[PDB]
Amino acid sequence: GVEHLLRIRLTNQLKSLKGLQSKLKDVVEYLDKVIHTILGKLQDVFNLNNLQKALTVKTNDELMVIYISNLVRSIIAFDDLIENKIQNKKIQEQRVKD
Amino acid sequence: NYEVSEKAFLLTQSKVSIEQRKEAAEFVLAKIKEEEMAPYYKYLCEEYLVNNGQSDLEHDEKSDSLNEWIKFDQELYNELCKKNESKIKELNEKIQKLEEDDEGELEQAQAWINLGEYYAQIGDKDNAEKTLGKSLSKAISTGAKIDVMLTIARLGFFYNDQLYVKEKLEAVNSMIEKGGDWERRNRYKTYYGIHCLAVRNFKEAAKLLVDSLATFTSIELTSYESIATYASVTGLFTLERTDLKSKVIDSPELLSLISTTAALQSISSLTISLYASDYASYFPYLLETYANVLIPCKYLNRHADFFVREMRRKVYAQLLESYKTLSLKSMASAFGVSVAFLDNDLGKFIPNKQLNCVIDRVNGIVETNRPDNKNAQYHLLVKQGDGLLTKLQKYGAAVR
């Protein structure tokens, strides 16, 4: 019923950047408020090519295999362009005779 | 008809024994009396020259030969007319009476085929195909289709012509496809693998030959020992060692075929040495396979060097897969060859990218380059992937 009444990547990066800006203000305001327990929970998440250096070599090898599938699918889409170009001429050949 | 073409082929090249030409001449003299070989008998001087090809008493007058039985004389000239009257003049008069009396249908077509086969032995191919073409329209079922295909099948073996034969054999087989038994289909299947040796199709020849039986003998079309060498040599070069263990080296017929005659020297000497990885005695088997098999056979003499050169390249690949490194001193000495001989064979193979290997000079260690997980996606995916895109751009860049 909601869909009847109403009849991505950029947004994900904007809210991800604001997460560090909002967290930075919470640490500075809490620093002057005391002068460690609350900051301990944020340090647990913040600490957990730094740790991925061991997996960086294996990551690039997997990205190439992904491109192998994309390269094959791209050729399939390229064959339809030549097939449609020849098919478009068949319509033009009928317009010249008729 | 193949018995003469097989024996007289030894007259072309004999580098060792002279008696091989006189022994093969005995089989030729016996067959020319029963059937007239005049088309092939005249083809002897038109095939290979400067050996026996200059000796004739009729068309061209020169005497150079090791065999004096291939020249015309007063006896063969009279026998040529006697065989021409009985097989043509006497038979056509009886067939002419059957045409006016309207006796049978396929009987007159089969009589034209048997008569048409006689024109092939007289040396006239114009009337042979003319009488065969008239009987082709009468062919419906496989009764008259086998005889029509049999006449054209002789054109390939007897006249040694690979051009106009297969085109006619395929048209007759594709018109009505039945096949009868599996042996009548061999005429199209066996000649298929034989024709692949003329255009050098390599592995394509052994497709139907390996699955073919070893007891197949066509007599006048082909012999028993001749077809045995075609399937043994070509089948070994096609299927790799993975398929050799479950097919070639272990077979009910092939193990029975090697014990019949010693002229094979393929599924025994070459296969066992390849399976046991013994390179000491494997090298002299290639010389015996070249001299005593490839040379005497008809279609196996066309490639010549293309056998041993290619078979030596693949036998090293079986050794490179079983070791990461090797010893140059053991390969260039202990196996029965020299140092300069090993560098000559591997010299042309490396730049052709036919194998991946590491050859050492000072250290003397032959190392194998193994792609590991690369396999067929390393250099093949880029070459075949972008190479076919070049063929795709051929008709798209220039349009029409």
Curated annotation (Swiss-Prot), chain A:
Keywords: Acetylation, Phosphoprotein, Proteasome. The keyword Glycoprotein does not apply. GO terms for cellular component: proteasome complex; proteasome regulatory particle, lid subcomplex; proteasome storage granule. GO terms for molecular function: metallopeptidase activity. GO terms for biological process: proteasome-mediated ubiquitin-dependent protein catabolic process; ubiquitin-dependent protein catabolic process. N-acetylated by NAT1. Signal peptide: none annotated. The keyword NAD does not apply. Present with 19800 molecules/cell in log phase SD medium. Belongs to the peptidase M67A family. Acts as a regulatory subunit of the 26S proteasome which is involved in the ATP-dependent degradation of ubiquitinated proteins. This is 26S proteasome regulatory subunit RPN8. It comes from Saccharomyces cerevisiae (strain ATCC 204508 / S288c) (Baker's yeast). The gene is RPN8. The chain holds residues 170 to 308 of 338 of the full protein.
From Swiss-Prot, chain B:
The keyword Phosphoprotein applies. GO terms for cellular component: nucleus; proteasome complex; proteasome regulatory particle; proteasome regulatory particle, lid subcomplex. Gene3D superfamilies: 1.25.40.570. Residues 201-373 form the PCI domain. Keywords: Nucleus, Phosphoprotein, Proteasome, TPR repeat. The keyword Nucleus applies. GO terms for biological process: proteasome-mediated ubiquitin-dependent protein catabolic process; ubiquitin-dependent protein catabolic process. SUPFAM superfamilies: TPR-like, Winged helix' DNA-binding domain. It is found in: Nucleus. TPR repeats lie at residues 109-142. GO terms for molecular function: structural molecule activity. The modification Phosphoserine is found at residue 55. Pfam families: PCI (PF01399), RPN7 (PF10602), RPN7_PSMD6_C (PF21154). The 26S proteasome is composed of a core protease, known as the 20S proteasome, capped at one or both ends by the 19S regulatory complex (RC). The RC is composed of at least 18 different subunits in two subcomplexes, the base and the lid, which form the portions proximal and distal to the 20S proteolytic core, respectively. Component of the lid subcomplex of the 19S RC. Component of the 19S cap proteasome complex which acts as a regulatory subunit of the 26S proteasome, involved in the ATP-dependent degradation of ubiquitinated proteins. Present with 51900 molecules/cell in log phase SD medium. This is 26S proteasome regulatory subunit RPN7. It comes from Saccharomyces cerevisiae (strain ATCC 204508 / S288c). The gene is RPN7.
